[model samples]
Target: HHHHHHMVHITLDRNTANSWLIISKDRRQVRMGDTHQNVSDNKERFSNYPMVLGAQRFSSGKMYWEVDVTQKEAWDLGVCRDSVQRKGQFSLSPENGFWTIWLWQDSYEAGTSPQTTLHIQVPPCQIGIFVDYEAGVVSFYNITDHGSLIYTFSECVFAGPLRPFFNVGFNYSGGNAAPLKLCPL
Candidate 1:
């Protein structure tokens, strides 16, 4: 069965990425790197975090995309408000304009108000993000487990456009050096 007709293709936005994020030229993959790029503290760039925003923005309708987080021990994948703060540190929650999940230290968690812990039996290699703008819903799916639902954030406030969010997190020397790549579907 078709989940939805709107399968948005997402690419990493280089201009808005943090200097510590090494984005591919194709703008499809991003990984955590050492030492900042010494780039300017621009309005679009994220200077303090090891994250990056997707190039595409969604204001209305349903949009879905997937990210390949295979082999990575720590990463953040989901959606965030277009108007979120980029220059400083912030928590990943709906109130702060972020609805995402974190895979850190081999554990999973949803970035909700209280930070829900997710105990997925089969870890996801590919994560699918689904968002309904008008309905104000953001859901995350475990694609590795046949697209099973992992977590959902409902009753969210969507006043402006939203972008796909990615954070390589802190690359632990040997565990999380893997890259987060955008999926074609």
Candidate 2:
């Protein structure tokens, strides 16, 4: 994918987060917490969902970011429109302004209003997300190796600026406490 040039370095923007999620000081990683930290609640902050957006937003051009999902069973890596609803329950489907590859309980899946099942040849420990805004597409790559494509959301019509979105999901059970780290390009 000759994608090294498109890397978009990013971090967790805690200001856009749910209190139950812990974003690292460097803003490079995040994980779900059992209790809410003393974070201020605001209109732009998330409440019902355990997700956060990148500090930066994109209006056009190619952008990319790689995240480490090693040893994790549940997490989400994707992008969402800057004005996407942050309050209340919402689906992470492309049609709902989210184009993500998620591991809910088991298995990797992306959605098109309905979740599309994926049978990855091998679990990917690192994932790379590439977005071509002008073309209205977001392609996800399994970055642990050769950036082999895992899935691509080709029908996006990003009307405004888009931001990187991360969901730490639940910290319940097993080693789900592991953080999702935005890897350096």
Candidate 3:
């Protein structure tokens, strides 16, 4: 088999960041703020969720990006359509326009329609996400171990532009306080 990798530099959208999310000046790093900041509510902002979206959107192309989660204990990373709802509680599943993989309590959960448990022998400090729009493929890799295939979601149908989405997980305590960083090429 042959492998083709795509590299992309993603920037965090500050407007989409939750009030408790602290985005870096360069917009490449995002961390959970030590304390919450009072901010106005907006349709684009995640009110009850601690998540953010990338500034760029992909409609058609082979896109790849990496996330640094070394210091984090729990997080969610993947892509979502621009049309995904931002308010209220929602499932991070493709049926709801969210295709994501979550790291929680040392477990990896693929956000399938009903969600699936992933058995990753080694923990991943850095995650690589690859999306092929036309091929209907969205994959995640354990980049810490030389791009070992972790999971692949097939037959994905993107009706609209898909944007990089991230969540540092919830709560202020535990090991989930670290930021979910978008790594540079």
Q: Which candidate number maximizes TM-score?
A: 2
- Per-prediction TM-score: 0.93, 0.95, 0.94
Please give the distance, in angstroms, between residue 130's alpha carbon in candidate 3 and its true position after superposition: 0.3
Count: clashes, candidate 3: 0
Tens-digit per-residue lDDT, 1-185, candidate 3: 12335787799998898888888899998877767767776779987878999999999889888889886777899999999998888889888888899987767899997779998887899988999999988999998878898889999987889999999887556657777777777
Worst 10 residues of 3 by lDDT: 1-10
List the candidate 2 regions with Cα displacement exceeding 4 Å. none
Can you tell me which runs of candidate 3 are displaced by over 4 Å?
Answer: 1-5
- Candidate 1 TM-score versus the reference: 0.93
Candidate 2 lDDT by residue in tens digits, 83-155: 8898988888766788888997778998666788887887899988899999888998887767788888886
Model 3 alpha-carbon miss at residue 102, Å: 0.5
A best-first ranking of the candidates according to their TM-score comes to 2, 3, 1
Model 3 clash pairs?
Answer: none
Q: Give lDDT for model 1.
A: 0.85
